[PDB]
Design an enzyme around this catalytic site. Structure first.
Site, PDB file in Angstrom:
ATOM      1  N   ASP A  33       0.906  -1.144   0.000  1.00  0.00           N
ATOM      2  CA  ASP A  33       0.000   0.000   0.000  1.00  0.00           C
ATOM      3  C   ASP A  33       0.945   1.192   0.000  1.00  0.00           C
ATOM      4  O   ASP A  33       2.064   1.092  -0.499  1.00  0.00           O
ATOM      5  CB  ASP A  33      -0.870   0.003   1.258  1.00  0.00           C
ATOM      6  CG  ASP A  33      -2.089   0.829   1.093  1.00  0.00           C
ATOM      7  OD1 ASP A  33      -2.051   1.963   0.568  1.00  0.00           O
ATOM      8  OD2 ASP A  33      -3.164   0.364   1.499  1.00  0.00           O
ATOM      9  N   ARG A  77       4.488   2.561  -5.150  1.00  0.00           N
ATOM     10  CA  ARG A  77       3.353   2.990  -5.956  1.00  0.00           C
ATOM     11  C   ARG A  77       3.244   2.192  -7.259  1.00  0.00           C
ATOM     12  O   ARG A  77       2.149   2.007  -7.789  1.00  0.00           O
ATOM     13  CB  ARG A  77       3.459   4.490  -6.256  1.00  0.00           C
ATOM     14  CG  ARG A  77       2.444   5.315  -5.470  1.00  0.00           C
ATOM     15  CD  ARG A  77       2.424   6.790  -5.867  1.00  0.00           C
ATOM     16  NE  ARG A  77       1.194   7.430  -5.399  1.00  0.00           N
ATOM     17  CZ  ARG A  77       1.149   8.421  -4.510  1.00  0.00           C
ATOM     18  NH1 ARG A  77       2.271   8.898  -3.980  1.00  0.00           N
ATOM     19  NH2 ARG A  77      -0.023   8.925  -4.132  1.00  0.00           N
ATOM     20  N   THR A 119      -9.647  -7.853  -7.824  1.00  0.00           N
ATOM     21  CA  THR A 119     -10.811  -7.815  -6.938  1.00  0.00           C
ATOM     22  C   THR A 119     -11.855  -6.843  -7.454  1.00  0.00           C
ATOM     23  O   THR A 119     -12.528  -6.155  -6.696  1.00  0.00           O
ATOM     24  CB  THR A 119     -10.420  -7.416  -5.499  1.00  0.00           C
ATOM     25  OG1 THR A 119      -9.800  -6.130  -5.519  1.00  0.00           O
ATOM     26  CG2 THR A 119      -9.447  -8.436  -4.891  1.00  0.00           C
ATOM     27  N   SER A 148     -17.538  -8.303 -10.126  1.00  0.00           N
ATOM     28  CA  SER A 148     -17.893  -7.332  -9.103  1.00  0.00           C
ATOM     29  C   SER A 148     -18.639  -8.013  -7.957  1.00  0.00           C
ATOM     30  O   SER A 148     -18.867  -9.230  -7.981  1.00  0.00           O
ATOM     31  CB  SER A 148     -18.773  -6.239  -9.701  1.00  0.00           C
ATOM     32  OG  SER A 148     -20.078  -6.717  -9.981  1.00  0.00           O
ATOM     33  N   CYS A 149     -19.014  -7.223  -6.953  1.00  0.00           N
ATOM     34  CA  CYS A 149     -19.762  -7.737  -5.807  1.00  0.00           C
ATOM     35  C   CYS A 149     -21.221  -7.980  -6.210  1.00  0.00           C
ATOM     36  O   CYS A 149     -21.811  -8.990  -5.844  1.00  0.00           O
ATOM     37  CB  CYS A 149     -19.695  -6.737  -4.629  1.00  0.00           C
ATOM     38  SG  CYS A 149     -19.867  -4.953  -5.032  1.00  0.00           S
ATOM     39  N   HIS A 176     -27.276  -0.286  -3.063  1.00  0.00           N
ATOM     40  CA  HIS A 176     -25.927  -0.457  -2.535  1.00  0.00           C
ATOM     41  C   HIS A 176     -25.548   0.468  -1.375  1.00  0.00           C
ATOM     42  O   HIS A 176     -26.011   1.608  -1.281  1.00  0.00           O
ATOM     43  CB  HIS A 176     -24.920  -0.273  -3.682  1.00  0.00           C
ATOM     44  CG  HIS A 176     -23.747  -1.200  -3.626  1.00  0.00           C
ATOM     45  ND1 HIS A 176     -22.587  -0.895  -2.946  1.00  0.00           N
ATOM     46  CD2 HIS A 176     -23.558  -2.431  -4.153  1.00  0.00           C
ATOM     47  CE1 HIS A 176     -21.731  -1.895  -3.061  1.00  0.00           C
ATOM     48  NE2 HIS A 176     -22.296  -2.841  -3.788  1.00  0.00           N
ATOM     49  N   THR A 179     -19.403   3.238  -0.299  1.00  0.00           N
ATOM     50  CA  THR A 179     -18.072   2.644  -0.421  1.00  0.00           C
ATOM     51  C   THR A 179     -16.989   3.744  -0.421  1.00  0.00           C
ATOM     52  O   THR A 179     -17.286   4.941  -0.446  1.00  0.00           O
ATOM     53  CB  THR A 179     -17.939   1.784  -1.700  1.00  0.00           C
ATOM     54  OG1 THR A 179     -17.830   2.639  -2.842  1.00  0.00           O
ATOM     55  CG2 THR A 179     -19.153   0.883  -1.861  1.00  0.00           C
ATOM     56  N   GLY A 209     -22.595  -2.242 -14.536  1.00  0.00           N
ATOM     57  CA  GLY A 209     -22.674  -3.134 -15.669  1.00  0.00           C
ATOM     58  C   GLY A 209     -22.678  -4.541 -15.129  1.00  0.00           C
ATOM     59  O   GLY A 209     -22.331  -5.490 -15.828  1.00  0.00           O
ATOM     60  N   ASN A 313     -21.328  -6.934   0.420  1.00  0.00           N
ATOM     61  CA  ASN A 313     -20.336  -6.575  -0.580  1.00  0.00           C
ATOM     62  C   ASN A 313     -18.890  -6.683  -0.092  1.00  0.00           C
ATOM     63  O   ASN A 313     -17.963  -6.766  -0.902  1.00  0.00           O
ATOM     64  CB  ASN A 313     -20.610  -5.162  -1.114  1.00  0.00           C
ATOM     65  CG  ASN A 313     -21.048  -4.183  -0.029  1.00  0.00           C
ATOM     66  OD1 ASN A 313     -22.170  -4.247   0.473  1.00  0.00           O
ATOM     67  ND2 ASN A 313     -20.159  -3.256   0.325  1.00  0.00           N
TER      68      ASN A 313
HETATM   69  N1  LIG Z   1     -16.027  -1.727  -1.467  1.00  0.00           N
HETATM   70  C1  LIG Z   1     -16.601  -2.897  -1.775  1.00  0.00           C
HETATM   71  O1  LIG Z   1     -17.556  -3.307  -1.103  1.00  0.00           O
HETATM   72  C2  LIG Z   1     -16.152  -3.748  -2.885  1.00  0.00           C
HETATM   73  C3  LIG Z   1     -16.767  -5.087  -3.214  1.00  0.00           C
HETATM   74  C4  LIG Z   1     -16.119  -5.747  -4.386  1.00  0.00           C
HETATM   75  C5  LIG Z   1     -15.100  -5.273  -5.084  1.00  0.00           C
HETATM   76  N2  LIG Z   1     -14.490  -4.019  -4.791  1.00  0.00           N
HETATM   77  C6  LIG Z   1     -13.356  -3.586  -5.616  1.00  0.00           C
HETATM   78  O2  LIG Z   1     -12.169  -3.896  -4.943  1.00  0.00           O
HETATM   79  C7  LIG Z   1     -11.184  -2.853  -5.067  1.00  0.00           C
HETATM   80  C8  LIG Z   1     -10.981  -2.527  -3.613  1.00  0.00           C
HETATM   81  O3  LIG Z   1     -11.888  -1.491  -3.218  1.00  0.00           O
HETATM   82  P1  LIG Z   1     -11.861  -1.101  -1.692  1.00  0.00           P
HETATM   83  O4  LIG Z   1     -13.221  -0.917  -1.161  1.00  0.00           O
HETATM   84  O5  LIG Z   1     -10.920  -1.876  -0.832  1.00  0.00           O
HETATM   85  O6  LIG Z   1     -11.238   0.404  -1.764  1.00  0.00           O
HETATM   86  P2  LIG Z   1     -10.312   1.143  -0.780  1.00  0.00           P
HETATM   87  O7  LIG Z   1     -10.073   2.518  -1.313  1.00  0.00           O
HETATM   88  O8  LIG Z   1     -10.901   1.060   0.585  1.00  0.00           O
HETATM   89  O9  LIG Z   1      -8.953   0.294  -0.805  1.00  0.00           O
HETATM   90  C9  LIG Z   1      -7.946   0.537  -1.842  1.00  0.00           C
HETATM   91  C10 LIG Z   1      -6.556   0.672  -1.196  1.00  0.00           C
HETATM   92  O10 LIG Z   1      -5.591   0.897  -2.262  1.00  0.00           O
HETATM   93  C11 LIG Z   1      -4.544   1.637  -1.710  1.00  0.00           C
HETATM   94  N3  LIG Z   1      -3.705   2.104  -2.842  1.00  0.00           N
HETATM   95  C12 LIG Z   1      -3.932   3.188  -3.650  1.00  0.00           C
HETATM   96  N4  LIG Z   1      -3.011   3.361  -4.592  1.00  0.00           N
HETATM   97  C13 LIG Z   1      -2.117   2.323  -4.398  1.00  0.00           C
HETATM   98  C14 LIG Z   1      -0.944   1.959  -5.106  1.00  0.00           C
HETATM   99  N5  LIG Z   1      -0.412   2.606  -6.143  1.00  0.00           N
HETATM  100  N6  LIG Z   1      -0.257   0.852  -4.654  1.00  0.00           N
HETATM  101  C15 LIG Z   1      -0.786   0.172  -3.574  1.00  0.00           C
HETATM  102  N7  LIG Z   1      -1.867   0.414  -2.860  1.00  0.00           N
HETATM  103  C16 LIG Z   1      -2.513   1.524  -3.323  1.00  0.00           C
HETATM  104  C17 LIG Z   1      -5.315   2.706  -0.957  1.00  0.00           C
HETATM  105  O11 LIG Z   1      -4.508   3.493  -0.038  1.00  0.00           O
HETATM  106  C18 LIG Z   1      -6.409   1.872  -0.254  1.00  0.00           C
HETATM  107  O12 LIG Z   1      -6.122   1.388   1.067  1.00  0.00           O
HETATM  108  C19 LIG Z   1     -11.839  -1.805  -5.958  1.00  0.00           C
HETATM  109  O13 LIG Z   1     -11.380  -1.974  -7.301  1.00  0.00           O
HETATM  110  C20 LIG Z   1     -13.328  -2.117  -5.855  1.00  0.00           C
HETATM  111  O14 LIG Z   1     -13.996  -1.786  -7.080  1.00  0.00           O
HETATM  112  C21 LIG Z   1     -14.996  -3.259  -3.713  1.00  0.00           C
END
Ligand SMILES: NC(=O)c1ccc[n+]([C@@H]2O[C@H](COP(=O)([O-])OP(=O)(O)OC[C@H]3O[C@@H](n4cnc5c(N)ncnc54)[C@H](O)[C@@H]3O)[C@@H](O)[C@H]2O)c1
Ligand SMILES: NC(=O)c1ccc[n+]([C@@H]2O[C@H](COP(=O)([O-])OP(=O)(O)OC[C@H]3O[C@@H](n4cnc5c(N)ncnc54)[C@H](O)[C@@H]3O)[C@@H](O)[C@H]2O)c1
Lengths: 330, 330
Positions: A33, A77, A119, A148-149, A176, A179, A209, A313
């Protein structure tokens, strides 16, 4: 066991880590991260949604020590710089949401990993796989997505309704929960104006979608479904509202019997069935990606019906992502 | 094994039942409210705040069977018609908020019970007992009160502070979660105009007697404290804000040391101590009735300081209620 490396310790990255602890086949060896091992540790320890971490986590030498096991921490990054192989990673869990194409997500393999599981739904032709839908179609591809979820919730259901009564056409609507992409108060979201307006203050119509994606995981249903969403003020767990027209007429009592049967057999652990007067919180922490609510659904007649199913989700999807990792290995 | 009956199967009535299941000295034998055994069972199986009941529950003959044991269900509005003695009830947990005077609460004794523990501060001279403050002053009374959720937080702390540096005067403020007494949208609350205002939309100023009451369970402090409250949009867990003048000068690091010591010894289980960057949700389900937030507190000088302590107004208080019961039962 399968050595897993996580990229993006976000909501999904963290919950995938938590649930990964109650599994004997997988093990998290590294996490990436953009944070210090002490902040990362505080993020794992306390959760406003799923409570305090169920175990011990200590910081040591810039790395985490969870349940007495050292987890390598990095803050790169660029994925290509992760040298995952130095820590023996097998599969990488792409949870950042920034690398959903093959060229982006492949930096993980050129960094030393073997395979990758996004994910989120891929943005190119990378194949999507859904438990209880087409896990059986995995053909050894080294980069895959877990869809997706909302899809993980709609696919298992549509599949059962299609296999018994044949879906002519369907129009889905998912209510939903909020998030990480929304705003606390009206702020900038130039890719989606509605999504930047105060989350907790509104019901925000949103696009998805996920319905269309069901036709890609279940080709038989290709082109027969589409839908939208409404973002509402709850921190977790959503529900899909599917309205479909069926080929072979059937009573609700009959639709009910179909779902419960799948829930009890082939779709066990993926599709669930309930006749209780449940509400969203009754599913916070739910592992089944689709829980049919018998009592909430309704039909206009034996060929026009509205079905409702629940999905956390966060936990459901996170557990399935781990299933996909176990599936694509060896 | 103490057999107890519950009058009022509400938020406290229900959490008490849940906490009691982990105890081997207490046994819930009967429950009374104004509903059916099947709605009662639903109220217990599903909780939006604390998850699904962690055990088994079924309805039978018109009563319930929870965890292999049968619980008697009644819907008697007048406590004197309860016949508690038919099931052998030792102590009754008065949890309706309607019988907080000896007169009304004695009806439970008239009904067969031997002792009563009101889950709210008495409305009359009925003695109040608070764990960590004055439990050792219990003199065999048949009807007592466990004070408030707020007094159960402030008393244990106010004692460590008094005993160590002496409190000349103090003013308290509690940022409290929403409760059953509040309303979803602007409605009638004849006895507290502000309390009727939409709970989820407002920061609601509210009066408390919890501060004064601390001097009643800790006589030394009598007359030295008073305060008010702010009702905010959260479903559970509140925090007290204590601003006080100290007789003996002490650094914040001196104050912390005292708390941490009382917490790690004399007040262990009643008063807790933390130095983490915690938030309210981090205490949903917390058993200690007062958790001192080291990092949140602020001092103006060695004789004027603001202290912060957290309390799950539902789970801690309900647990200490079972404590008092066990206590007065000998
Ligand atoms: N939120 C949900 O309920 C849900 C359900 C299914 C799928 N998703 C998908 O899963 C992914 C995760 O979403 P999420 O809710 O955890 O979001 P989130 O923003 O909470 O988590 C993403 C993490 O990525 C980190 N990050 C950002 N840039 C980075 C980089 N260059 N290198 C490494 N880490 C980096 C951020 O600091 C953050 O902690 C998304 O693509 C989302 O579409 C989310
Ligand atoms: N809410 C809290 O966090 C909290 C913490 C400490 C103490 N208390 C005190 O405990 C009491 C419990 O409050 P609560 O939050 O559970 O409220 P609640 O309204 O959730 O529970 C009260 C229950 O009493 C039932 N009831 C009403 N009239 C009755 C009657 N005649 N006979 C039997 N049952 C009857 C109601 O149907 C309800 O289920 C209150 O007096 C309150 O001051 C509450």
């Amino acid at each position: 066991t399968i050595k897993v490396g996580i990229n993006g310790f976000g909501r999904i990255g963290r919950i995938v880590f938590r649930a990964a602890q109650k599994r004997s086949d997988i093990e998290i060896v590294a996490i990436n991260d953009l944070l210090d091992a002490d902040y990362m540790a505080y993020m794992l320890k306390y959760d406003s949604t799923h409570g305090r971490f169920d175990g011990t986590v200590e910081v040591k030498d810039g790395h985490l020590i969870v349940n007495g096991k050292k987890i390598r921490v990095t803050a790169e990054r660029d994925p290509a710089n992760l040298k995952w192989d130095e820590v023996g990673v097998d599969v990488v869990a792409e949870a950042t949401g920034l690398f959903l194409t093959d060229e982006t997500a492949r930096k993980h393999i050129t960094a030393g990993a073997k395979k990758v599981v996004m994910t989120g739904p891929s943005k190119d032709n990378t194949p999507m796989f859904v438990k209880g839908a087409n896990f059986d179609k995995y053909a050894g591809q080294d980069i895959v997505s877990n869809a997706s979820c909302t899809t993980n919730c709609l696919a298992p259901l549509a599949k059962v309704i299609n296999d018994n009564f044949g879906i002519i056409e369907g129009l889905m609507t998912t209510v939903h929960a909020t998030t990480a992409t929304q705003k606390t108060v009206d702020g900038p979201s130039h890719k989606d104006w509605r999504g930047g307006r105060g989350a907790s203050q509104n019901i925000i119509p949103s696009s998805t979608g996920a319905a269309k994606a069901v036709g890609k995981v279940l080709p038989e249903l290709n082109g027969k479904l589409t839908g939208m969403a409404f973002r509402v003020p709850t921190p977790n767990v959503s529900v899909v509202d599917l309205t479909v027209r069926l080929e072979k007429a059937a009573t609700y009592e009959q639709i009910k019997a179909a779902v419960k049967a799948a829930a009890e057999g082939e779709m066990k652990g993926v599709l669930g069935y309930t006749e209780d007067d449940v509400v969203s919180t009754d599913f916070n922490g739910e592992v089944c990606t689709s829980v049919f609510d018998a009592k909430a659904g309704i039909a206009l007649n034996d060929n026009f019906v509205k079905l409702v199913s629940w999905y956390d989700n966060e936990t459901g999807y996170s557990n399935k992502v781990l299933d996909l990792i176990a599936h694509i290995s060896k």
